[PDB]
Design a protein around this nucleic acid. Sequence first.
RNA 1: CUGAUAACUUCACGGCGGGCUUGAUGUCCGCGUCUACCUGGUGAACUGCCGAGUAGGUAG
Lengths: 197, 309
Amino acid sequence: KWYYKTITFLPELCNNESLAAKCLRVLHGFNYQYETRNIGVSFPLWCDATVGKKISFVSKNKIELDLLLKQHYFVQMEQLQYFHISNTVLVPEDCTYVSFRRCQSIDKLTAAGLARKIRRLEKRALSRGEQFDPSSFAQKEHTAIAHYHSLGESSKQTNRNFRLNIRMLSEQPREGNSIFSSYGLSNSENSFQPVPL
Amino acid sequence: KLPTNLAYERSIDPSDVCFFVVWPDDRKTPLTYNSRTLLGQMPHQVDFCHVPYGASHIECSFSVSFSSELRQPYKCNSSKVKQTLVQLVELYETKIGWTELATRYLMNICNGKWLWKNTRKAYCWNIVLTPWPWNGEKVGFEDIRTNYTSRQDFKNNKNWSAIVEMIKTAFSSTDGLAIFEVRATLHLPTNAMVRPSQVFTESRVFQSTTIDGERSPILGAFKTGAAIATIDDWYPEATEPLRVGRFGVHREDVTCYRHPSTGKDFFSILQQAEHYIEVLSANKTPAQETINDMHFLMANLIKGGMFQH
RNA sequence: CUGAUAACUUCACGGCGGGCUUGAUGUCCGCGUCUACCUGGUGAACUGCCGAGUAGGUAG
Protein backbone atom coordinates (compact mmCIF):
# COMPACT_ATOMS: atom_id res chain seq x y z
CA LYS A 1 0.00 0.00 0.00
CA TRP A 2 2.81 2.39 -0.93
CA TYR A 3 4.48 3.65 -4.03
CA TYR A 4 7.56 4.22 -6.17
CA LYS A 5 9.00 7.06 -8.25
CA THR A 6 11.80 7.18 -10.82
CA ILE A 7 14.80 9.44 -10.40
CA THR A 8 15.71 9.32 -14.09
CA PHE A 9 19.28 9.93 -15.30
CA LEU A 10 19.10 11.93 -18.57
CA PRO A 11 22.16 13.96 -19.51
CA GLU A 12 22.65 11.43 -22.36
CA LEU A 13 26.41 11.48 -21.59
CA CYS A 14 27.03 9.52 -18.39
CA ASN A 15 28.16 6.21 -17.00
CA ASN A 16 25.33 4.64 -15.07
CA GLU A 17 26.86 2.52 -12.30
CA SER A 18 29.09 5.38 -11.12
CA LEU A 19 26.10 7.71 -10.66
CA ALA A 20 23.86 5.02 -9.13
CA ALA A 21 26.57 4.11 -6.62
CA LYS A 22 26.96 7.63 -5.33
CA CYS A 23 23.17 7.96 -5.21
CA LEU A 24 23.34 5.01 -2.82
CA ARG A 25 26.28 6.73 -1.07
CA VAL A 26 24.08 9.74 -0.28
CA LEU A 27 21.31 7.29 0.64
CA HIS A 28 23.74 6.07 3.31
CA GLY A 29 24.33 9.76 4.02
CA PHE A 30 20.70 9.73 5.10
CA ASN A 31 19.71 7.45 8.03
CA TYR A 32 22.37 8.54 10.47
CA GLN A 33 19.69 10.71 12.17
CA TYR A 34 18.70 7.53 13.89
CA GLU A 35 18.18 4.03 12.48
CA THR A 36 15.02 4.67 10.46
CA ARG A 37 15.75 1.71 8.25
CA ASN A 38 12.85 1.95 5.83
CA ILE A 39 14.26 2.52 2.30
CA GLY A 40 14.68 0.23 -0.71
CA VAL A 41 16.80 1.19 -3.69
CA SER A 42 15.14 -0.92 -6.40
CA PHE A 43 17.13 -0.62 -9.67
CA PRO A 44 14.25 -1.15 -12.11
CA LEU A 45 16.36 -2.22 -15.10
CA TRP A 46 18.87 -5.06 -15.03
CA CYS A 47 20.40 -6.30 -18.28
CA ASP A 48 23.36 -8.62 -18.77
CA ALA A 49 25.33 -5.36 -18.62
CA THR A 50 24.49 -1.70 -17.78
CA VAL A 51 22.81 -1.12 -14.39
CA GLY A 52 19.78 0.87 -15.48
CA LYS A 53 19.16 4.46 -16.55
CA LYS A 54 16.81 4.81 -13.55
CA ILE A 55 16.88 4.60 -9.81
CA SER A 56 13.70 4.15 -7.83
CA PHE A 57 13.86 4.76 -4.09
CA VAL A 58 10.86 3.80 -1.99
CA SER A 59 9.56 5.34 1.22
CA LYS A 60 6.68 4.44 3.54
CA ASN A 61 4.08 7.20 4.06
CA LYS A 62 4.62 10.19 1.71
CA ILE A 63 6.49 12.60 4.06
CA GLU A 64 9.59 10.60 5.01
CA LEU A 65 10.21 10.51 1.25
CA ASP A 66 10.79 14.25 1.09
CA LEU A 67 12.96 14.08 4.16
CA LEU A 68 14.97 11.61 2.06
CA LEU A 69 14.70 13.48 -1.22
CA LYS A 70 16.00 16.73 0.30
CA GLN A 71 19.28 14.99 1.11
CA HIS A 72 21.54 18.11 0.70
CA TYR A 73 22.56 16.72 -2.68
CA PHE A 74 20.10 17.70 -5.44
CA VAL A 75 19.44 21.20 -4.07
CA GLN A 76 22.74 22.49 -5.44
CA MET A 77 22.57 19.98 -8.31
CA GLU A 78 19.15 20.50 -9.95
CA GLN A 79 19.50 24.08 -11.19
CA LEU A 80 19.65 22.60 -14.71
CA GLN A 81 18.17 19.58 -16.51
CA TYR A 82 20.34 16.57 -15.71
CA PHE A 83 18.26 14.27 -13.47
CA HIS A 84 14.51 14.01 -12.90
CA ILE A 85 12.98 13.20 -9.51
CA SER A 86 9.52 11.85 -10.30
CA ASN A 87 6.62 13.44 -8.44
CA THR A 88 5.13 11.03 -5.93
CA VAL A 89 2.73 8.80 -7.88
CA LEU A 90 0.66 6.08 -6.19
CA VAL A 91 1.79 2.72 -7.50
CA PRO A 92 0.32 0.94 -10.53
CA GLU A 93 -0.14 -2.63 -9.32
CA ASP A 94 1.06 -4.23 -12.59
CA CYS A 95 4.75 -4.89 -11.88
CA THR A 96 6.90 -7.75 -10.60
CA TYR A 97 8.19 -8.31 -7.05
CA VAL A 98 11.94 -8.80 -7.42
CA SER A 99 14.84 -8.83 -4.97
CA PHE A 100 18.15 -7.01 -4.44
CA ARG A 101 20.73 -8.74 -2.23
CA ARG A 102 24.43 -8.15 -1.61
CA CYS A 103 25.72 -11.68 -1.86
CA GLN A 104 29.32 -11.57 -0.48
CA SER A 105 30.52 -14.43 -2.71
CA ILE A 106 31.67 -12.29 -5.61
CA ASP A 107 33.80 -10.54 -2.98
CA LYS A 108 35.22 -13.72 -1.41
CA LEU A 109 36.25 -15.52 -4.61
CA THR A 110 39.47 -13.52 -4.94
CA ALA A 111 42.85 -14.83 -3.77
CA ALA A 112 42.91 -12.12 -1.11
CA GLY A 113 39.63 -13.63 0.10
CA LEU A 114 40.87 -17.12 0.85
CA ALA A 115 44.10 -15.55 2.12
CA ARG A 116 41.99 -13.76 4.76
CA LYS A 117 39.98 -16.95 5.30
CA ILE A 118 42.94 -19.27 5.90
CA ARG A 119 44.62 -16.71 8.16
CA ARG A 120 41.36 -16.53 10.12
CA LEU A 121 41.12 -20.34 10.21
CA GLU A 122 44.15 -20.49 12.53
CA LYS A 123 43.49 -17.13 14.01
CA ARG A 124 40.89 -19.19 15.87
CA ALA A 125 42.68 -22.48 16.38
CA LEU A 126 42.24 -21.56 20.09
CA SER A 127 40.10 -24.67 20.46
CA ARG A 128 43.52 -26.21 20.87
CA GLY A 129 44.17 -29.22 18.67
CA GLU A 130 46.85 -30.32 16.22
CA GLN A 131 47.77 -27.49 13.87
CA PHE A 132 47.64 -28.22 10.16
CA ASP A 133 50.19 -27.28 7.61
CA PRO A 134 48.45 -24.80 5.27
CA SER A 135 50.02 -26.52 2.24
CA SER A 136 46.77 -28.26 1.23
CA PHE A 137 44.11 -25.53 1.03
CA ALA A 138 44.64 -25.10 -2.71
CA GLN A 139 42.06 -22.87 -4.35
CA LYS A 140 39.20 -23.78 -6.67
CA GLU A 141 41.26 -24.43 -9.78
CA HIS A 142 38.25 -24.02 -12.12
CA THR A 143 35.17 -21.93 -11.30
CA ALA A 144 32.05 -20.84 -13.24
CA ILE A 145 30.87 -17.57 -11.69
CA ALA A 146 27.45 -16.16 -12.60
CA HIS A 147 26.31 -12.64 -13.48
CA TYR A 148 26.87 -9.72 -11.10
CA HIS A 149 27.25 -5.93 -11.04
CA SER A 150 29.62 -3.95 -8.82
CA LEU A 151 29.18 -0.56 -7.12
CA GLY A 152 32.30 1.32 -6.01
CA GLU A 153 31.81 2.86 -2.55
CA SER A 154 34.07 3.32 0.49
CA SER A 155 34.01 2.97 4.28
CA LYS A 156 31.98 5.30 6.46
CA GLN A 157 34.80 6.82 8.55
CA THR A 158 37.97 4.91 7.60
CA ASN A 159 39.81 4.79 4.28
CA ARG A 160 38.80 1.23 3.46
CA ASN A 161 37.78 0.67 -0.14
CA PHE A 162 35.41 -2.20 -0.87
CA ARG A 163 32.71 -2.54 -3.51
CA LEU A 164 29.17 -3.89 -3.26
CA ASN A 165 27.27 -6.33 -5.43
CA ILE A 166 23.67 -6.65 -6.64
CA ARG A 167 21.56 -9.52 -8.01
CA MET A 168 17.95 -9.72 -9.18
CA LEU A 169 16.14 -12.69 -7.62
CA SER A 170 12.34 -12.90 -7.80
CA GLU A 171 10.54 -14.08 -4.65
CA GLN A 172 7.32 -14.13 -2.56
CA PRO A 173 5.64 -10.66 -2.41
CA ARG A 174 3.81 -10.43 0.95
CA GLU A 175 6.13 -10.21 3.97
CA GLY A 176 5.87 -7.72 6.89
CA ASN A 177 6.22 -3.94 7.09
CA SER A 178 9.67 -3.88 5.53
CA ILE A 179 12.56 -2.71 7.66
CA PHE A 180 16.14 -3.45 6.58
CA SER A 181 19.76 -2.77 7.71
CA SER A 182 21.38 0.57 6.90
CA TYR A 183 22.06 1.37 3.23
CA GLY A 184 19.19 0.18 1.22
CA LEU A 185 19.58 -3.43 -0.04
CA SER A 186 17.58 -6.48 1.12
CA ASN A 187 20.26 -8.69 2.75
CA SER A 188 18.84 -8.17 6.23
CA GLU A 189 18.05 -11.94 6.63
CA ASN A 190 15.59 -11.25 9.47
CA SER A 191 13.10 -9.91 6.92
CA PHE A 192 14.32 -10.40 3.34
CA GLN A 193 11.81 -8.11 1.54
CA PRO A 194 11.14 -7.93 -2.20
CA VAL A 195 10.83 -4.33 -3.35
CA PRO A 196 9.16 -4.19 -6.77
CA LEU A 197 9.83 -3.11 -10.34
CA LYS B 1 74.25 -9.89 -52.80
CA LEU B 2 71.32 -11.69 -51.08
CA PRO B 3 70.96 -14.91 -53.12
CA THR B 4 67.90 -17.14 -53.49
CA ASN B 5 68.97 -19.25 -50.50
CA LEU B 6 70.66 -18.05 -47.30
CA ALA B 7 69.81 -19.12 -43.77
CA TYR B 8 71.57 -19.35 -40.42
CA GLU B 9 70.73 -21.39 -37.36
CA ARG B 10 70.72 -20.00 -33.84
CA SER B 11 73.53 -20.33 -31.29
CA ILE B 12 71.76 -19.72 -27.96
CA ASP B 13 68.67 -21.78 -27.31
CA PRO B 14 66.88 -21.70 -23.95
CA SER B 15 63.92 -23.66 -22.59
CA ASP B 16 60.79 -23.19 -20.47
CA VAL B 17 61.04 -21.78 -17.00
CA CYS B 18 59.38 -23.74 -14.21
CA PHE B 19 58.02 -22.26 -10.98
CA PHE B 20 57.96 -24.15 -7.69
CA VAL B 21 56.94 -23.29 -4.13
CA VAL B 22 59.05 -24.16 -1.08
CA TRP B 23 57.50 -24.76 2.35
CA PRO B 24 59.03 -24.52 5.85
CA ASP B 25 58.71 -28.35 6.06
CA ASP B 26 61.60 -28.42 3.53
CA ARG B 27 59.98 -29.62 0.29
CA LYS B 28 58.79 -28.14 -3.00
CA THR B 29 55.53 -28.40 -4.96
CA PRO B 30 54.42 -27.02 -8.34
CA LEU B 31 52.58 -23.72 -8.66
CA THR B 32 48.95 -23.80 -9.81
CA TYR B 33 46.57 -21.11 -10.96
CA ASN B 34 42.81 -20.80 -11.49
CA SER B 35 40.46 -19.54 -14.13
CA ARG B 36 37.11 -17.98 -13.46
CA THR B 37 34.42 -18.48 -16.08
CA LEU B 38 32.43 -15.29 -16.63
CA LEU B 39 28.78 -16.18 -17.25
CA GLY B 40 25.91 -14.00 -18.35
CA GLN B 41 22.34 -14.00 -17.09
CA MET B 42 19.21 -15.99 -17.86
CA PRO B 43 32.69 -16.47 -22.71
CA HIS B 44 36.18 -15.38 -21.73
CA GLN B 45 38.48 -16.87 -19.11
CA VAL B 46 40.35 -14.71 -16.63
CA ASP B 47 43.36 -16.41 -15.02
CA PHE B 48 44.93 -15.39 -11.72
CA CYS B 49 48.11 -16.80 -10.18
CA HIS B 50 49.15 -15.76 -6.67
CA VAL B 51 51.73 -17.06 -4.21
CA PRO B 52 50.06 -19.38 -1.66
CA TYR B 53 49.75 -18.49 2.01
CA GLY B 54 52.42 -19.64 4.42
CA ALA B 55 55.05 -20.48 1.81
CA SER B 56 58.72 -19.53 1.96
CA HIS B 57 59.99 -18.75 -1.55
CA ILE B 58 59.63 -19.37 -5.27
CA GLU B 59 62.26 -21.35 -7.17
CA CYS B 60 62.52 -20.91 -10.93
CA SER B 61 64.51 -23.21 -13.18
CA PHE B 62 65.60 -23.38 -16.81
CA SER B 63 68.61 -24.37 -18.89
CA VAL B 64 70.48 -22.58 -21.66
CA SER B 65 73.20 -23.93 -23.95
CA PHE B 66 75.61 -22.00 -26.16
CA SER B 67 76.86 -23.50 -29.40
CA SER B 68 78.93 -22.68 -32.46
CA GLU B 69 76.36 -22.64 -35.24
CA LEU B 70 77.17 -19.08 -36.40
CA ARG B 71 80.42 -19.89 -38.19
CA GLN B 72 78.86 -21.22 -41.42
CA PRO B 73 75.42 -20.77 -43.01
CA TYR B 74 72.92 -23.59 -42.77
CA LYS B 75 72.03 -22.85 -46.43
CA CYS B 76 73.73 -20.95 -49.24
CA ASN B 77 72.99 -20.86 -52.97
CA SER B 78 76.40 -19.60 -54.08
CA SER B 79 80.04 -20.28 -53.25
CA LYS B 80 80.79 -16.53 -53.31
CA VAL B 81 78.91 -15.31 -50.25
CA LYS B 82 79.93 -18.16 -47.93
CA GLN B 83 83.64 -17.39 -48.36
CA THR B 84 82.99 -13.76 -47.41
CA LEU B 85 80.98 -14.77 -44.34
CA VAL B 86 83.41 -17.37 -42.96
CA GLN B 87 86.33 -14.99 -43.22
CA LEU B 88 84.13 -12.23 -41.79
CA VAL B 89 83.66 -14.22 -38.60
CA GLU B 90 87.35 -15.25 -38.63
CA LEU B 91 88.61 -11.66 -38.92
CA TYR B 92 86.12 -10.60 -36.24
CA GLU B 93 87.46 -13.11 -33.76
CA THR B 94 91.08 -12.39 -34.71
CA LYS B 95 90.86 -8.62 -34.35
CA ILE B 96 88.11 -7.71 -31.87
CA GLY B 97 87.48 -10.69 -29.60
CA TRP B 98 84.40 -12.50 -28.30
CA THR B 99 84.41 -10.97 -24.84
CA GLU B 100 81.99 -8.05 -25.29
CA LEU B 101 79.10 -10.16 -26.59
CA ALA B 102 79.85 -12.94 -24.09
CA THR B 103 79.84 -10.60 -21.08
CA ARG B 104 76.77 -8.82 -22.41
CA TYR B 105 74.79 -12.09 -22.63
CA LEU B 106 76.05 -13.52 -19.33
CA MET B 107 75.00 -10.32 -17.54
CA ASN B 108 71.41 -10.87 -18.71
CA ILE B 109 71.51 -14.44 -17.46
CA CYS B 110 73.09 -13.59 -14.09
CA ASN B 111 70.82 -10.78 -12.87
CA GLY B 112 67.35 -12.09 -13.65
CA LYS B 113 66.36 -10.28 -16.81
CA TRP B 114 64.34 -13.42 -17.66
CA LEU B 115 62.22 -12.75 -14.57
CA TRP B 116 59.98 -10.44 -16.57
CA LYS B 117 58.24 -8.07 -14.09
CA ASN B 118 58.53 -10.69 -11.32
CA THR B 119 61.22 -8.84 -9.38
CA ARG B 120 59.16 -5.70 -8.93
CA LYS B 121 57.92 -5.90 -5.32
CA ALA B 122 60.57 -8.41 -4.30
CA TYR B 123 62.93 -8.55 -1.34
CA CYS B 124 65.95 -10.53 -2.55
CA TRP B 125 66.64 -12.96 -5.37
CA ASN B 126 69.62 -15.28 -5.68
CA ILE B 127 70.80 -16.94 -8.89
CA VAL B 128 72.81 -20.18 -8.99
CA LEU B 129 74.52 -21.51 -12.12
CA THR B 130 75.68 -25.08 -12.75
CA PRO B 131 77.95 -25.04 -15.82
CA TRP B 132 79.14 -27.86 -18.04
CA PRO B 133 81.94 -28.88 -18.64
CA TRP B 134 83.17 -27.84 -15.20
CA ASN B 135 85.07 -28.91 -12.08
CA GLY B 136 84.05 -27.35 -8.78
CA GLU B 137 81.03 -26.33 -6.76
CA LYS B 138 78.31 -24.13 -8.17
CA VAL B 139 78.58 -20.49 -9.25
CA GLY B 140 76.50 -18.26 -6.98
CA PHE B 141 75.31 -14.68 -7.47
CA GLU B 142 73.77 -13.43 -4.25
CA ASP B 143 71.25 -10.60 -3.62
CA ILE B 144 71.36 -8.88 -6.99
CA ARG B 145 69.55 -5.73 -5.84
CA THR B 146 72.20 -4.67 -3.29
CA ASN B 147 75.28 -6.64 -4.36
CA TYR B 148 75.47 -6.68 -8.19
CA THR B 149 74.76 -3.57 -10.21
CA SER B 150 77.31 -3.03 -13.00
CA ARG B 151 79.82 -4.72 -15.32
CA GLN B 152 82.73 -3.81 -13.04
CA ASP B 153 80.89 -5.34 -10.10
CA PHE B 154 80.42 -8.74 -11.75
CA LYS B 155 84.12 -8.94 -12.66
CA ASN B 156 85.05 -8.81 -8.95
CA ASN B 157 83.67 -12.33 -8.52
CA LYS B 158 85.71 -15.50 -8.18
CA ASN B 159 83.97 -17.54 -10.90
CA TRP B 160 83.57 -15.08 -13.75
CA SER B 161 86.64 -15.42 -15.96
CA ALA B 162 86.07 -19.17 -16.26
CA ILE B 163 82.41 -18.71 -17.24
CA VAL B 164 83.16 -16.07 -19.86
CA GLU B 165 86.08 -18.16 -21.15
CA MET B 166 83.94 -21.26 -21.66
CA ILE B 167 81.40 -19.13 -23.52
CA LYS B 168 84.29 -17.82 -25.65
CA THR B 169 85.49 -21.36 -26.42
CA ALA B 170 81.93 -22.33 -27.36
CA PHE B 171 81.58 -19.44 -29.81
CA SER B 172 85.10 -19.99 -31.17
CA SER B 173 85.90 -23.71 -31.39
CA THR B 174 84.26 -25.62 -34.22
CA ASP B 175 82.14 -28.47 -32.83
CA GLY B 176 82.15 -26.75 -29.43
CA LEU B 177 79.42 -26.46 -26.79
CA ALA B 178 78.71 -25.09 -23.31
CA ILE B 179 75.66 -25.81 -21.15
CA PHE B 180 74.42 -23.85 -18.13
CA GLU B 181 71.66 -24.90 -15.74
CA VAL B 182 70.08 -21.89 -14.02
CA ARG B 183 67.90 -21.77 -10.96
CA ALA B 184 66.87 -18.61 -9.13
CA THR B 185 65.29 -18.11 -5.71
CA LEU B 186 62.72 -15.31 -5.23
CA HIS B 187 61.61 -14.18 -1.76
CA LEU B 188 58.35 -12.49 -2.73
CA PRO B 189 56.07 -10.88 -0.08
CA THR B 190 52.94 -12.49 1.35
CA ASN B 191 50.27 -13.13 -1.32
CA ALA B 192 52.30 -11.49 -4.05
CA MET B 193 51.08 -12.09 -7.58
CA VAL B 194 52.96 -13.94 -10.33
CA ARG B 195 53.19 -12.83 -13.99
CA PRO B 196 53.75 -15.73 -16.42
CA SER B 197 53.40 -15.65 -20.20
CA GLN B 198 50.07 -15.33 -22.03
CA VAL B 199 48.71 -17.18 -25.05
CA PHE B 200 48.08 -15.39 -28.34
CA THR B 201 44.33 -14.78 -28.60
CA GLU B 202 42.75 -11.86 -30.43
CA SER B 203 41.37 -12.29 -22.26
CA ARG B 204 44.44 -13.08 -20.12
CA VAL B 205 44.85 -16.85 -20.52
CA PHE B 206 48.19 -18.26 -19.37
CA GLN B 207 50.67 -20.58 -21.06
CA SER B 208 50.85 -23.84 -19.15
CA THR B 209 52.39 -27.31 -19.03
CA THR B 210 51.58 -30.41 -17.01
CA ILE B 211 54.10 -31.30 -14.31
CA ASP B 212 53.20 -34.72 -12.75
CA GLY B 213 49.44 -34.23 -12.91
CA GLU B 214 49.33 -30.58 -11.81
CA ARG B 215 49.09 -27.88 -14.42
CA SER B 216 51.60 -25.07 -14.03
CA PRO B 217 52.40 -21.76 -15.74
CA ILE B 218 55.75 -21.54 -17.51
CA LEU B 219 56.71 -18.04 -18.78
CA GLY B 220 57.64 -19.13 -22.26
CA ALA B 221 60.40 -20.71 -24.34
CA PHE B 222 60.65 -18.00 -26.99
CA LYS B 223 59.93 -15.25 -24.48
CA THR B 224 62.82 -16.19 -22.18
CA GLY B 225 65.27 -16.11 -25.09
CA ALA B 226 64.12 -12.64 -26.01
CA ALA B 227 65.44 -11.56 -22.60
CA ILE B 228 68.97 -12.90 -23.04
CA ALA B 229 69.13 -11.02 -26.36
CA THR B 230 68.33 -7.52 -25.06
CA ILE B 231 71.79 -6.24 -25.90
CA ASP B 232 71.16 -3.77 -28.73
CA ASP B 233 72.58 -0.48 -27.49
CA TRP B 234 74.39 0.61 -30.66
CA TYR B 235 71.65 2.34 -32.71
CA PRO B 236 72.16 6.05 -33.58
CA GLU B 237 71.77 8.36 -30.56
CA ALA B 238 71.15 5.40 -28.27
CA THR B 239 69.77 5.44 -24.76
CA GLU B 240 68.08 2.12 -23.92
CA PRO B 241 68.67 -1.50 -25.04
CA LEU B 242 66.65 -3.52 -27.55
CA ARG B 243 65.92 -7.06 -28.68
CA VAL B 244 68.34 -7.72 -31.51
CA GLY B 245 66.04 -7.80 -34.50
CA ARG B 246 66.83 -6.54 -37.94
CA PHE B 247 64.70 -3.37 -37.74
CA GLY B 248 65.33 -2.13 -34.18
CA VAL B 249 61.77 -2.67 -32.97
CA HIS B 250 60.93 -1.15 -29.62
CA ARG B 251 57.78 -2.94 -28.58
CA GLU B 252 55.49 -0.78 -26.45
CA ASP B 253 56.09 2.66 -27.99
CA VAL B 254 55.20 1.26 -31.40
CA THR B 255 57.86 2.89 -33.63
CA CYS B 256 60.88 1.04 -34.97
CA TYR B 257 64.37 2.40 -34.61
CA ARG B 258 66.98 1.45 -37.27
CA HIS B 259 64.59 2.05 -40.17
CA PRO B 260 66.24 1.40 -43.58
CA SER B 261 66.16 5.13 -44.36
CA THR B 262 68.83 5.58 -41.67
CA GLY B 263 70.81 2.68 -43.13
CA LYS B 264 71.39 1.07 -39.73
CA ASP B 265 69.33 -2.09 -40.24
CA PHE B 266 70.76 -5.54 -40.94
CA PHE B 267 70.48 -5.56 -44.72
CA SER B 268 72.09 -2.19 -45.43
CA ILE B 269 74.91 -3.16 -43.06
CA LEU B 270 75.20 -6.73 -44.42
CA GLN B 271 75.46 -5.54 -48.05
CA GLN B 272 78.63 -3.60 -47.11
CA ALA B 273 80.62 -6.51 -45.66
CA GLU B 274 83.48 -6.12 -48.13
CA HIS B 275 84.01 -2.73 -46.46
CA TYR B 276 84.21 -4.45 -43.08
CA ILE B 277 86.86 -6.90 -44.24
CA GLU B 278 88.47 -3.83 -45.82
CA VAL B 279 88.71 -1.97 -42.51
CA LEU B 280 89.42 -4.92 -40.18
CA SER B 281 92.59 -5.81 -42.14
CA ALA B 282 94.09 -2.40 -41.26
CA ASN B 283 95.82 -1.50 -37.99
CA LYS B 284 93.25 0.70 -36.19
CA THR B 285 89.47 0.44 -35.89
CA PRO B 286 87.05 3.28 -34.97
CA ALA B 287 84.52 2.50 -32.23
CA GLN B 288 81.77 4.80 -33.52
CA GLU B 289 80.47 3.35 -36.78
CA THR B 290 82.74 0.39 -37.53
CA ILE B 291 83.02 -1.51 -34.26
CA ASN B 292 79.39 -0.65 -33.53
CA ASP B 293 78.31 -2.29 -36.80
CA MET B 294 80.44 -5.42 -36.53
CA HIS B 295 78.92 -5.93 -33.07
CA PHE B 296 75.45 -5.63 -34.57
CA LEU B 297 76.18 -8.02 -37.44
CA MET B 298 77.73 -10.64 -35.16
CA ALA B 299 74.84 -10.30 -32.71
CA ASN B 300 72.45 -10.72 -35.63
CA LEU B 301 74.03 -13.91 -37.03
CA ILE B 302 73.84 -15.54 -33.61
CA LYS B 303 70.08 -14.96 -33.75
CA GLY B 304 69.79 -16.85 -37.02
CA GLY B 305 66.97 -16.53 -39.50
CA MET B 306 66.83 -16.64 -43.28
CA PHE B 307 68.39 -13.74 -45.19
CA GLN B 308 66.68 -14.19 -48.52
CA HIS B 309 65.27 -11.96 -51.25
C1' C C 1 -6.03 4.34 -91.28
C1' U C 2 -2.61 -2.54 -90.35
C1' G C 3 -3.18 -7.72 -98.32
C1' A C 4 -9.12 -3.23 -94.48
C1' U C 5 -13.84 -4.37 -91.40
C1' A C 6 -16.42 -10.13 -90.00
C1' A C 7 -15.02 -15.27 -88.82
C1' C C 8 -17.29 -21.46 -82.06
C1' U C 9 -13.86 -27.92 -86.46
C1' U C 10 -16.01 -32.00 -83.48
C1' C C 11 -18.06 -36.90 -81.61
C1' A C 12 -16.04 -42.48 -80.26
C1' C C 13 -11.46 -45.33 -79.32
C1' G C 14 -8.45 -52.62 -74.62
C1' G C 15 -1.02 -53.78 -78.50
C1' C C 16 -0.79 -58.33 -76.32
C1' G C 17 1.69 -63.55 -75.71
C1' G C 18 7.23 -66.18 -74.83
C1' G C 19 12.63 -65.90 -73.52
C1' C C 20 19.96 -69.18 -68.81
C1' U C 21 24.85 -64.10 -71.41
C1' U C 22 29.35 -67.07 -69.92
C1' G C 23 34.74 -69.23 -69.60
C1' A C 24 40.22 -67.32 -67.83
C1' U C 25 43.17 -63.41 -65.45
C1' G C 26 50.55 -61.58 -60.31
C1' U C 27 50.60 -53.92 -61.47
C1' C C 28 55.71 -53.27 -59.35
C1' C C 29 61.06 -51.31 -58.41
C1' G C 30 63.30 -46.19 -55.90
C1' C C 31 62.41 -41.82 -52.34
C1' G C 32 66.02 -36.60 -46.00
C1' U C 33 60.55 -30.87 -46.07
C1' C C 34 64.24 -27.40 -43.42
C1' U C 35 65.93 -22.30 -41.13
C1' A C 36 63.70 -17.60 -37.59
C1' C C 37 59.84 -15.66 -33.61
C1' C C 38 58.51 -11.24 -26.04
C1' U C 39 50.74 -10.93 -26.52
C1' G C 40 50.43 -7.52 -22.53
C1' G C 41 46.52 -7.22 -16.21
C1' U C 42 50.43 0.52 -15.64
C1' G C 43 48.82 1.24 -10.11
C1' A C 44 44.30 -2.16 -9.98
C1' A C 45 37.68 -5.89 -5.27
C1' C C 46 40.12 -3.90 1.81
C1' U C 47 39.93 -4.59 7.11
C1' G C 48 37.02 -7.40 10.86
C1' C C 49 33.42 -10.63 13.71
C1' C C 50 30.08 -15.69 14.24
C1' G C 51 30.14 -20.44 12.39
C1' A C 52 33.90 -27.45 15.63
C1' G C 53 33.21 -26.07 9.24
C1' U C 54 37.82 -25.12 1.04
C1' A C 55 30.29 -25.33 2.53
C1' G C 56 27.65 -21.06 5.07
C1' G C 57 25.75 -15.64 7.61
C1' U C 58 27.27 -10.76 8.82
C1' A C 59 29.41 -4.98 9.82
C1' G C 60 31.78 -0.94 7.23
